[PDB]
Design an enzyme around this catalytic site. Sequence first.
Site, short mmCIF file in Angstrom:
data_model
loop_
_atom_site.label_atom_id
_atom_site.label_comp_id
_atom_site.label_asym_id
_atom_site.label_seq_id
_atom_site.Cartn_x
_atom_site.Cartn_y
_atom_site.Cartn_z
N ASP A 15 -14.16 -9.35 9.44
CA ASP A 15 -12.82 -9.19 10.04
C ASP A 15 -12.63 -7.82 10.61
O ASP A 15 -11.63 -7.14 10.31
CB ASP A 15 -11.69 -9.53 9.02
CG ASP A 15 -10.36 -9.97 9.71
OD1 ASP A 15 -10.34 -10.29 10.92
OD2 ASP A 15 -9.35 -10.07 8.99
N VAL B 298 0.85 -1.17 0.00
CA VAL B 298 0.00 0.00 0.00
C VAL B 298 0.90 1.24 0.00
O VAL B 298 1.84 1.35 0.80
CB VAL B 298 -0.88 0.05 1.25
CG1 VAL B 298 -1.76 1.25 1.25
CG2 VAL B 298 -1.76 -1.21 1.36
C1 LIG Z 1 -5.32 1.10 -0.21
C2 LIG Z 1 -6.57 0.44 0.42
C3 LIG Z 1 -7.46 -0.21 -0.43
C4 LIG Z 1 -8.64 -0.81 0.08
C5 LIG Z 1 -8.85 -0.69 1.43
O1 LIG Z 1 -10.02 -1.29 1.92
C6 LIG Z 1 -7.97 -0.04 2.26
C7 LIG Z 1 -8.28 0.07 3.74
C8 LIG Z 1 -6.81 0.53 1.76
C9 LIG Z 1 -5.82 1.14 2.71
C10 LIG Z 1 -4.98 0.21 3.35
C11 LIG Z 1 -4.00 0.70 4.22
C12 LIG Z 1 -3.05 -0.27 4.94
C13 LIG Z 1 -1.76 0.13 5.36
C14 LIG Z 1 -0.95 -0.78 6.02
N1 LIG Z 1 -1.40 -2.04 6.29
C15 LIG Z 1 -2.64 -2.44 5.92
N2 LIG Z 1 -3.08 -3.77 6.26
C16 LIG Z 1 -4.23 -4.37 5.70
C17 LIG Z 1 -5.01 -5.23 6.69
O2 LIG Z 1 -4.10 -6.08 7.39
C18 LIG Z 1 -3.09 -5.39 8.09
C19 LIG Z 1 -2.26 -4.54 7.14
C20 LIG Z 1 -3.52 -1.58 5.24
C21 LIG Z 1 -3.87 2.07 4.52
C22 LIG Z 1 -4.77 2.94 3.91
C23 LIG Z 1 -4.66 4.42 4.20
N3 LIG Z 1 -3.93 4.80 5.30
O3 LIG Z 1 -5.18 5.30 3.52
C24 LIG Z 1 -5.74 2.52 2.96
N4 LIG Z 1 -6.65 3.43 2.38
#
Ligand SMILES: Cc1ccc(O)c(C)c1-c1cc(-c2ccnc(N3CCOCC3)c2)cc(C(N)=O)c1N
EC number: 2.7.11.1
Length: 280
Positions: A155, A47
């Site tokens: 989840d 990400v």
């Molecule tokens: C890009 C995206 C696409 C669809 C979506 O549903 C989401 C939430 C995201 C999204 C994901 C994350 C993010 C950062 C680090 N680890 C995780 N992880 C996932 C779950 O397991 C732990 C690790 C997720 C950060 C952001 C952000 N701050 O803006 C964000 N928008």
Amino acid sequence: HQLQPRRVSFRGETLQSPGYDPSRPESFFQQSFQRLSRLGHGSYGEVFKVRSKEDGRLYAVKRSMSPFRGPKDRARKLAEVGSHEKVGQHPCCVRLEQAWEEGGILYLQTELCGPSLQQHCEAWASLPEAQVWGYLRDTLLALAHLHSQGLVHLDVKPANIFLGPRGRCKLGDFGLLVELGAGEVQEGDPRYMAPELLQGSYGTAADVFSLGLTILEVACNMELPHGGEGWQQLRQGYLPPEFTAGLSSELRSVLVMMLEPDPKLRATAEALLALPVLRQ
Ligand SMILES: Cc1ccc(O)c(C)c1-c1cc(-c2ccnc(N3CCOCC3)c2)cc(C(N)=O)c1N
């Protein structure tokens, strides 16, 4: 040669965008965004915090780790977009801007959010309870929205709730959302799993239970058990004193409503939101 990027959507084409030239060999992601930082990486992919060349605004983009292995692998990954599109626009849910595939890699571009609650806790000993009430209320609003749409997040956990402006919470990671058949879905974190899911039973109540343990965990800053007797003893209809040191009577009272083991006796998100303590 490489096929052009294609939009992924389950509503109703090649991706065209101001600043994107198909004649050039770099990817849509490379041409159309400035990579600012990496926010996360795992088997799920990476990400990135980015700025958009199309509008100048900040976003997050998630891209999968390796090319699709076959048609079903592709279908299972793309299904995240269909689920996210069912959630749509809501102030307490992460908003999907667009998704596309290129080179067998799936990209989801969403609004940019802050740290997850997991991260916020880790770098905070305990969160001020007024902050916790905000997180509880905002994620309840997300759950009322999902349930209104006949969706269940299987989840809900601190890593899947992201901070926004002035104390606000948005729920994200809709790949393990199911519609009320269920569709394919992966294993949720056992720490936060409603007890009825052991028998494969699910419903609107399951994510209320998971939010209850999520908020319990962030409020007490103690690891919840992943199995064994301690897992069972969080699913009996009382709060083990081990986890409630510091927690106000008011917060305890609401958590026990969320943690009721019988999903028929468990409060709904709307009933919780209607409590005087969660007003506004
Ligand atoms: C890009 C995206 C696409 C669809 C979506 O549903 C989401 C939430 C995201 C999204 C994901 C994350 C993010 C950062 C680090 N680890 C995780 N992880 C996932 C779950 O397991 C732990 C690790 C997720 C950060 C952001 C952000 N701050 O803006 C964000 N928008």
